[PDB]
Design a binder for this molecule. Structure first.
Ligand SMILES: [Mg+2]
Lengths: 257, 98, 308, 344, 49, 25, 34
């Protein structure tokens, strides 16, 4: 059985919702409704199979190669990405208890700022934010996810996923939409991706990758339609970008000690 | 009932008896019909119901329209025990006769 | 929005058992307003042209792809919402919201049927449907299953195959233009267009240009072609063409006849998430078959009703 | 500083290259030229003090260096040997592995949490307490399956609930009762401070035997039962060594007499997970008066063992389940004894 | 074809690869287009390629 | 199938050599 | 090329419609069915 994890301050999030980002009803829809739907779907899909004993992340990693296991792959990816998103937008990572943790707001770390500096030609974090929203609104034509990710080259970069993609595994990034017209350079990118796949030396048809997610934002209408409405996803993304759990973001960042 | 030996490195098998007089489990470290079915699904050519109408997976109200030489079908049903003509079908025929 | 209005729907009104006032607004009117705004914001000075003509004339170009995006989305929503008329069931605003038990609930498409065209008197459409999908139960189950399966914003269409006659694209041939062969069901995602005659071969042409440019690079670098360079590319090209080899003459095109929307924006407002099945069922009950029977083109009389 | 740390990790090797150089050339062509310059370099400048200091330096460093010395902390930082890479250059494989561990411990678990799923290691490490075992749990473990009808030992007719799929089905109710009694007796010996020996030779049982033995401070055998272990202890095991321990089960580091260490040391409770293949041990235990416990299948004599536990013995899950229950009973007993002698 | 033996038709000419490879033709892989798939009373699946 | 058919190939060539040799005798 | 004709003693003729597995092509199948 895959059950929805217990978020901290669940009573607060249920009574009033996450501040400045989502309403009580909207957060209900995005988590207490959609996550339950997704988890029950996954349980019914993987019941009576070896995959029932693995967490969604390992499920998506295992099922990435297999074509036919696209339902379980998509379900696991959506569950994991949704939890990542909600975790990074949590107001308080740890319950206040008898301590006044709310007295201080979270801020990005100097290591994160330096990482941005090197990664984006020494551009400001706000510049990267505006470029991120522009890319998100220009690329994802429908449902999808937005990621700021870190590769093995120690440099952050932006990744846009359509429907239910995974930053971790690159052939399933779902970055490109082939429904509409496509460009020569993009076709070449797909071709070199195919060649890199062909280079694989295992029957499983797997290629190593280490693209880890530092920041995740859900673009599914289940999150924004109720409050912001049609066509305002840009404002929704802007708001979530400005309001984040930088403790979680920094913890995701790799320290090296 | 038994613990399969160690050298079986495959996660699939088939079997008939849990235990036997020889203190072994009659099994075979096999199972590939799953792969045949998955390959067929990949081919993705649906099966057409030639001659036979009224796809079985669906309920219909056409059965009431049952007018086709029912005597032959009834003869078939009576002769259920098709194994031994002088004994099996004979005793089934005797039951039907009674 | 005036150029894309419809008699059935009105402003500040709910649909019969399908959409509330707010549901209809946020589903149709907000979407059409936003699409019109952005489409006119983009370079579409030839607005007087029909949407279908715009899509056909402008395509196969990343530089002019957002125009196709928005126009195709608008046309898709238009066609998908056109067929709806309303149903007998209770309005959603009064109908209780569904919960997790909806998933466990078992469908009854295998044992029931409703809203048959024969009731409205479209025996032509009924005969076509039976000859194509076997039975109305087959057809209904296929439609609902496919639409519930599609997750991202998309549509499910009842398409009719039209086999282009051997010609050099000579127009104005009345009484023989719109002739279909068989009925099929198709899925489209985001901005997909169910016509296929302005769509087939895009990747093949991209691959051809790519291999040609790679050949130029090899020649200018003084390289020699390899076994894979001469065999793998040839095999890929051959399979591509054979797969998109419907017929010798301009292949085969598809005439739309019906479309159903799967975008969550259409049904999450008044059905939550668990109610996608219920929304699809009510959509089925809310099809006016007169529109689809009107859109159904003639059958291929040539050789078929000729039987000679 | 950090520049000295990042100076390519191998610098000033030209000095080594030079000291390698000038050696291949013969001496006759170099040394005369260098030695014919001392007459010039002597000059007249004062040198006494400087040369005395230099000589003292040579004596102290070159001639007084200690090649071998002498007559004859907290590992706060992990991966001390680990070294960092350059900021501009990509991650190292080790750095990737550590980042992987960080992700696994923090973000990988995200998603959903699993429930009502079986994990084999939990049978060994988190066994239930005897009073909480259920017939459902035993059936899930598979204790109910027995040998085929064709191998049935009629002496076990009282433990059969029936036959299904061509094999006998043990009565889990009787299994549960006998298991409760066995758990109580093992716990009793645990408080008494006796010696509990768990014996299982079938493949894969070593993990369970070792865990049980360690958590009840007992002993285990998994390779083979040397015949005469108890009936011929003087010969089989006299060479090995014993300990003297206090009531708290702590070594006291007291020298032992040769005779004291050469006396026999006999188990107080013998649990056998494979009685069928371990007949010799049961006979030695009976003839040496050692109470024994066993898991009895439908083809094993129940009379050889004082406290039988009717159940399957050919499956690791069942044997692990039962052995873990017994081990936790022994553990609670040991805990009670430790508490009592720690605080009266 | 994918675990199933299928009845294969030829496009009016057997390839010269058949004459070249003889009885060892199983070594090489070819491309097939599945016209139809049907059933038989014995439970067998008869597919045409 | 390929990893089986290569072994089958080698086996068939060796055995056909053997049987041609025996037939020649 | 090389020898081009072989007998039926060691070449499995799969019936039409029958489901098969890769192992069927091995030399082992011939030994098993004999
Ligand atoms: Mg046994």
């Amino acid at each position: 059985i895959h059950v929805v994890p217990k978020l901290p301050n669940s009573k607060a999030l249920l009574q009033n919702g996450v501040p400045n980002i989502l309403s009580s009803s909207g957060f209900k829809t995005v988590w207490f409704d959609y996550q339950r739907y997704l988890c029950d779907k996954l349980t019914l899909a993987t019941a009576g199979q070896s995959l029932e004993s693995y967490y969604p992340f390992h499920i998506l990693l295992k099922t990435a190669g297999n074509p036919l296991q696209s339902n379980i792959f998509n379900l696991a990816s959506s569950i994991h990405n949704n939890h990542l998103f909600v975790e990074n937008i949590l107001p308080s990572a740890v319950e206040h208890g008898t301590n006044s943790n709310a007295v201080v707001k979270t801020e990005p770390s100097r290591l994160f700022l330096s990482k941005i500096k090197d990664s984006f030609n020494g551009s400001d974090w706000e510049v990267v934010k505006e470029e991120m929203i522009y890319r998100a609104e220009n690329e994802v034509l429908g449902q999808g996810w937005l990621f700021l990710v870190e590769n093995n080259e120690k440099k952050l970069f932006i990744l846009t996923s359509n429907n239910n993609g995974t930053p971790y595994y690159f052939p399933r990034n779902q970055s490109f939409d082939l429904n509409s017209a496509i460009s020569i350079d993009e076709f070449a990118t797909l071709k070199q991706m195919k060649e890199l796949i062909g280079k694989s030396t295992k029957l499983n048809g797997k290629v190593q990758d280490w693209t880890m997610p530092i920041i995740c934002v859900n673009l599914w209408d289940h999150a924004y339609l109720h409050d912001y409405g049609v066509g305002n996803r840009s404002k929704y993304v802007k708001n979530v970008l400005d309001n984040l759990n930088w403790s979680v973001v920094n913890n995701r960042i790799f320290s090296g000690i | 009932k038994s613990a399969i030996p160690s050298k079986i490195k495959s996660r699939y098998l088939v079997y008939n008896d849990l235990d036997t007089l020889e203190r072994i489990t009659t099994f075979e470290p096999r199972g590939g019909t799953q792969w045949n079915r998955l390959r067929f699904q990949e081919m993705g050519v649906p099966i057409v119901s030639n001659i036979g109408r009224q796809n079985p997976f669906f309920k219909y109200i056409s059965r009431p329209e049952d007018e086709s030489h029912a005597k032959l079908s009834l003869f078939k049903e009576m002769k259920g025990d098709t194994d031994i003509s002088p004994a099996a079908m004979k005793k089934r025929l005797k039951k039907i006769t009674a | 929005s005036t150029r894309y209005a419809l008699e059935h729907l009105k402003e500040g009104a709910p649909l019969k058992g399908l959409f509330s006032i707010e549901g209809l607004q946020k589903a149709w009117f907000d979407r059409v307003k936003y699409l019109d705004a952005k489409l006119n914001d983009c370079t579409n000075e030839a607005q007087q042209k029909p949407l279908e003509t715009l899509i056909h004339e402008n395509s196969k170009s990343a530089s002019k792809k957002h125009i196709v995006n928005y126009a195709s989305s608008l046309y898709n929503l238009k066609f998908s919402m056109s067929s709806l008329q309303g149903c007998i069931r209770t309005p959603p605003e009064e109908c209780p919201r569904l919960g997790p038990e909806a998933l466990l609930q078992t469908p009854d498409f295998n044992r029931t049927i409703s809203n048959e065209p024969l009731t409205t008197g479209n025996e032509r459409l009924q005969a076509a449907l039976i000859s194509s999908f076997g039975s109305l139960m087959e057809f209904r189950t296929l439609l609902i299953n496919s639409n519930l399966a599609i997750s991202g914003d998309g549509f499910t269409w009842l398409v009719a195959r039209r086999q282009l006659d051997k010609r050099a694209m000579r127009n104005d041939m009345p009484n023989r233009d719109i002739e279909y062969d068989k009925l099929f069901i198709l899925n489209t995602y985001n901005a997909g267009t169910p016509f296929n005659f302005s769509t087939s071969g895009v990747m093949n042409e991209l691959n051809n240009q790519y291999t040609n440019m790679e050949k130029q690079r090899a020649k200018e670098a003084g390289n020699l072609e390899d076994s894979e360079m001469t065999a793998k590319q040839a095999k890929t090209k051959f399979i591509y063409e054979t797969q998109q080899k419907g017929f010798s003459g301009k292949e085969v095109s598809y005439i739309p006849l019906l479309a159903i929307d799967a975008s969550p924006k259409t049904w999450l407002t008044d059905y939550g998430v668990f109610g996608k099945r219920e929304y699809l069922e009510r959509v089925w009950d809310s099809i006016e078959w007169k529109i689809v029977e009107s859109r159904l083109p003639q059958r291929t009389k040539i050789q078929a009703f000729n039987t000679l | 500083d950090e520049v000295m740390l990042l100076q390519q990790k191998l610098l000033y090797d030209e000095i080594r290259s030079e000291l390698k150089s000038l050696s291949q050339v013969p001496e006759d062509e170099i040394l005369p030229e260098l030695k014919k310059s001392l007459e010039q370099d002597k000059l007249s400048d004062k040198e006494q003090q400087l040369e005395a200091e230099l000589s003292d330096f040579f004596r102290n460093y070159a001639l007084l260096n200690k090649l071998f010395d002498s007559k004859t902390a907290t590992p706060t930082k992990p991966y001390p040997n680990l070294i960092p890479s350059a900021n501009d250059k990509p991650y190292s494989s080790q750095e990737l592995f550590l980042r992987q561990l960080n992700h696994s411990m923090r973000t990988a678990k995200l998603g959903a949490t699993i429930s009502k799923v079986y994990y084999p290691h939990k049978d060994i490490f988190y066994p239930p307490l005897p009073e909480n075992i259920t017939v459902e749990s035993l059936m899930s473990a598979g204790v109910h399956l027995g040998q085929s009808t064709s191998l049935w030992r009629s002496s076990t007719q009282s433990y059969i609930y029936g036959e299904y799929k061509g094999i006998h089905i043990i009565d889990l109710n009787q299994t549960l009762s006998y298991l409760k009694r066995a758990a109580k007796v093992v716990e009793g010996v645990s408080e008494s401070g006796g010696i509990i020996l768990f014996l299982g030779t079938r493949q894969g049982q070593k993990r369970g035997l070792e865990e049980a033995a360690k958590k009840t401070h007992g002993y285990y055998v998994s390779t083979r039962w040397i015949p005469g272990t108890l009936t011929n202890s003087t010969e089989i095991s006299g060479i090995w060594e014993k300990q003297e321990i206090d009531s708290n089960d702590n070594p006291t580091e007291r020298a032992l007499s040769p005779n004291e260490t050469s006396k026999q040391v006999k188990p107080d409770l013998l649990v056998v997970l494979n009685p069928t293949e371990n007949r010799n041990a049961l006979l030695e235990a009976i003839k040496s008066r050692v109470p024994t416990i066993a898991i009895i299948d439908t083809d094993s004599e129940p009379s050889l063992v004082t406290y039988p536990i009717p159940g399957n013995d050919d499956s690791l899950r069942s044997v692990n389940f039962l052995l873990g229950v017994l081990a936790r009973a022994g553990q609670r007993g040991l805990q009670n004894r430790l508490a009592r002698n720690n605080e009266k | 074809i994918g675990g199933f033996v299928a009845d294969v038709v030829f496009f009016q000419s057997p390839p010269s690869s058949f004459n070249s490879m003889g009885d060892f033709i199983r070594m090489k892989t070819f491309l097939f287009e599945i016209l139809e798939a049907s059933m038989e009373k014995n439970g067998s699946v008869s597919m045409h390629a | 199938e390929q990893e089986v058919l290569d072994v089958w190939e080698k086996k068939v060539v060796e055995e056909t050599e053997l049987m041609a040799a025996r037939t020649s005798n | 090329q090389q020898t081009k004709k072989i007998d039926q003693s060691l070449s499995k003729k799969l019936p039409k419609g029958t489901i098969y597995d890769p192992f069927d092509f091995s030399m082992g199948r011939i030994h098993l069915d004999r």
